[PDB]
Design a protein around this nucleic acid. Structure first.
Lengths: 88, 106, 271, 56, 55
RNA sequence: CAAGCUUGAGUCUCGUAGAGGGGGGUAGAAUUCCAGGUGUAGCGGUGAAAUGCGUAGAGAUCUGGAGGAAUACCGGUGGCGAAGGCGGCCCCCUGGACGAAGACUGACGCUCAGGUGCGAAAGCGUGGGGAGCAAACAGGAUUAGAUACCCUGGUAGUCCACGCCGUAAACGAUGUCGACUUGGAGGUUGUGCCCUUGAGGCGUGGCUUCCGGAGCUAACGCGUUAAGUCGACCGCCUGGGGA
RNA sequence: UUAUUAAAAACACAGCACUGUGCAAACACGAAAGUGGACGUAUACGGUGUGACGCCUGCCCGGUGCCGGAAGGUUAAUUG
């Protein structure tokens, strides 16, 4: 998974505090970082279905978090999807 | 920087090339900002079974903390060195600076 | 990559071509080109000595360095180039002193890789060493059979040779034909295997595609008259005889190797 | 199952010791087990049945 | 704390023919039995222990 | 609709166990084959035989070599995985689960037609590889016959890379999620407490095997891992054949 | 493709298979030198049969051929 330092950096830049590790923005950012990191692994290991299942779990969890955020506050949703480079 | 435990056997006829091999390996490990936790020259030991029609191989043990590039170079060196008849690199959880039983027997 | 063309024409239906986006799209290196005139399979008597040769696209000969005797000096690969004279691709390398040469492109090589020949070269694909300095079991190509003569074995696309044993002044090689041969250790070889391995996957697709390569049609002996071929004529389709060459030598089984000079180097014949 | 006939022992006790050692090593059972192929389902069912009958 | 280099200790968990003894005979925990099996296999690789009584 | 809350659901910290997956390397035992030494008339196989190999020197034994496949002992109604499945050792990449004490978000949840993905073995396509085993096939037996069981061989296949196939008694013949309801003996994996007496005792989680109480069931049996008492959603059934 | 009575179902063909060939290659033209094969090197080259693709390609090694075997029998020049 992500190292401790990368996780701390993401939590700091996406959270309202250094301890706000549960915010929707922090969770979506961590999931996006893990997906982007896994992208390179699966480019080389196209036959790793067992890990791709966890990758798809991460993708679906990020999708549900983004849906909840868009339904809750669309402004933060837009800021997040522009800061992370989403929307296909 | 992960910790590794390196054990390699040398041909018995090449026992005096072992100090030079150790010198080169420590040079390569510390040159890459790595540490050496333990280094033990067990000397010649009777083999439990013949390896390449040989008995009485020369054993050396190393405990190093080094990146993966230098460890890959060390494995390549072991593979291409004809004097090293057998080697094995293993990861360890933490640094090991305690004397192994082979030298703890004395 | 291996791509199949869409059947927009009966001649294009079965064409399967090999595309390589890394090949140089441009003219080859001029100082390493020569005139390569066609022969039509005719010898100096003007007679056809090898049938089914003729026509095809004009080709210029690339001077490929098969000796690799520029030791000690590193070289970098500038680009991979198409070579019409062989099935493999060739790489234009640039030595440190400014000399450019053509070598057979091994598998995995790309522009920017660094190669070197000599007894001190590192063991990696592209390097050339005397076979006594190469570990037993390794896979090599462009092998010499006489020291300093130039590589002659494993030069086709995708081919390679593995050193199976070394003793005294000789090493034993397993050729791509499955034959075990002895070669003296001072002969040189290049690490790795020849690139363009998917060359065998291509399908020409139409009769004209073979004509571009200078291959004229092959007439079956049984389709001729008795004066032309031992397989003769007959009312209808008749064979009734053992298959032979146009000159009466039994094909399909009869061994033709007769060379007592080189028998001492053949450890075991192919099978 | 190496048996070295030590001094001051008759042959019969050495032979009986050799048999005891070769049976504690389980070589005959193994070479009788390995002479025919047992499907993975068959060996799993046999192990399950043996574990079930080892309950008394 | 089972070390493949501790052949004096590993020889207590192998038979006279070099085979690993089952955990039911020595009554050792499953976790330390797995550690012992791994250590014995590694020591067999390093030719510190025999694979069999033959070689 | 608006604002909340933390108990459902997630994030972070530190660790734990594991044949979870993908890639590369390597080790030993054994089978087969090749070459040679010793050695001589049998070997192999079966209920018994014969086909088969063997005086051109087999089988046995010893030495060297080649190649492929699978990993004895550990090993265990043991472990991991959604399922199919996963078993030498080492390294590289990587998913999930669990536990301790906290911090964080604040219903973000459950189920899911159509849809998509994974999916044993056999089978198919291309290129390799091929020791053992072995559909088809051949021969020897048995038999009234024997297109079989048994024997001697043996091709595809089994193995690798990449695609396809999408089926199994794919089974717990038991859909997923959540709550509640007496017990006993174990296994495995964390964690806490105590002159730690001990490989100790006492708690507290996760997964797991057997027995059994109420209850339920046509019965067999299930029984806190329910086939008991309920709730949400889905799939499916409507006599046997035809099918 | 039968110039000048036959244009076709014949020949070729891409594809397939077998087989030979380790490079001074096999093979071919050459009393020879040499040349072609090829400034190529088994993913290459020659020969033979078949003839895109799809589904496939069963049984027979007695005869003839080819390949392997080397014990034995027979057997040339030579030897005398």
């Amino acid at each position: 998974s992500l190292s401790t330092e990368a996780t701390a950096k993401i939590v700091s830049e996406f959270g309202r505090d250094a301890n706000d590790t549960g915010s929707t923005e922090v969770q979506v950012a961590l999931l996006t970082a893990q997906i982007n990191h896994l992208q390179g692994h699966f480019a080389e290991h196209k036959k790793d279905h067992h890990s791709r299942r966890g990758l798809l779990r991460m993708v679906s969890q990020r999708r549900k978090l983004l849906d909840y955020l868009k339904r809750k506050d669309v402004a933060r949703y837009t800021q997040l999807i522009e800061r992370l480079g989403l929307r296909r | 920087m992960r910790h590794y435990e390196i054990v390699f056997m040398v041909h018995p006829d090449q026992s005096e090339q072992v100090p030079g091999m150790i010198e080169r390996y420590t040079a390569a490990i510390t040159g890459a900002e790595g540490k050496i936790h333990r280094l033990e020259d067990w000397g010649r030991r009777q083999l439990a079974y013949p390896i390449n029609k040989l008995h009485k191989a020369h054993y050396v043990l190393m405990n190093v903390e080094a990146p993966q590039e230098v460890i890959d170079e060390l494995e390549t060196t072991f593979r291409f060195n004809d004097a090293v008849i057998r080697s094995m690199v293993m990861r360890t959880k933490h640094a090991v600076t305690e004397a192994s039983p082979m030298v703890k027997a004395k | 990559a291996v791509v199949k063309c869409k059947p927009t024409s009966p001649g294009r239906r079965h064409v399967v071509k090999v595309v390589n986006p890394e090949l140089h799209k441009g003219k080859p290196f001029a100082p390493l080109l020569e005139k390569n005139s066609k022969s039509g399979g005719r010898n100096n008597n003007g007679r056809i000595t090898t049938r089914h040769i003729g026509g095809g696209h004009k080709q210029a000969y690339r001077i490929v360095d098969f000796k690799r005797n520029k030791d000690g000096i590193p070289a970098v690969v500038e680009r991979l180039e198409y070579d019409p004279n062989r099935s493999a691709n060739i790489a234009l390398v640039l030595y440190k002193d400014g000399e450019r040469r053509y070598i057979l492109a091994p598998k995995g090589l790309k522009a920017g890789d660094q190669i070197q020949s000599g007894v001190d070269a590192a063991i990696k694909p592209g390097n050339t060493l005397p076979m006594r300095n190469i570990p037993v079991g390794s896979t090599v190509h462009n092998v010499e059979m006489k020291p300093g003569k130039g590589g002659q074995l494993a030069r086709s696309a995708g081919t390679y040779v593995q050193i199976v044993a070394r003793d005294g002044a000789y090493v034993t090689l397993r050729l791509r034909s499955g034959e075990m041969r002895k070669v003296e250790a001072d002969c040189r070889a290049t690490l790795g295997e020849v690139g363009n391995a998917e060359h065998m996957l291509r399908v020409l697709g139409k009769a004209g595609a073979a004509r571009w390569r200078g291959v004229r049609p092959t007439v079956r002996g049984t389709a001729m008259n008795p004066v032309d071929h031992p397989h003769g004529g007959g009312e209808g389709r008749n064979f009734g005889k053992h298959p032979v060459t146009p000159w009466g030598v039994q094909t399909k089984g009869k061994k033709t190797r007769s060379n007592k000079r080189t028998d001492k180097f053949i450890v075991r014949r192919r099978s | 199952p190496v048996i070295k006939v030590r001094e001051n022992e008759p042959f019969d006790v050495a032979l009986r010791r050799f048999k005891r050692s070769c049976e504690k090593a389980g070589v005959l059972a193994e070479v009788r087990r390995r002479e025919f192929y047992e499907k993975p389902t068959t060996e799993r069912k046999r192990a399950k049945a043996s574990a079930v009958k080892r309950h008394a | 704390e089972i070390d493949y280099k501790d052949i004096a200790t590993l020889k207590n968990y192998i038979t006279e023919s070099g085979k690993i003894v089952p955990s039911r005979i020595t009554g050792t925990r499953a976790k330390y039995q797995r550690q012992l099996a791994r250590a014995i296999k590694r020591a067999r690789y390093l030719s510190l222990l025999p694979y069999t009584d033959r070689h």
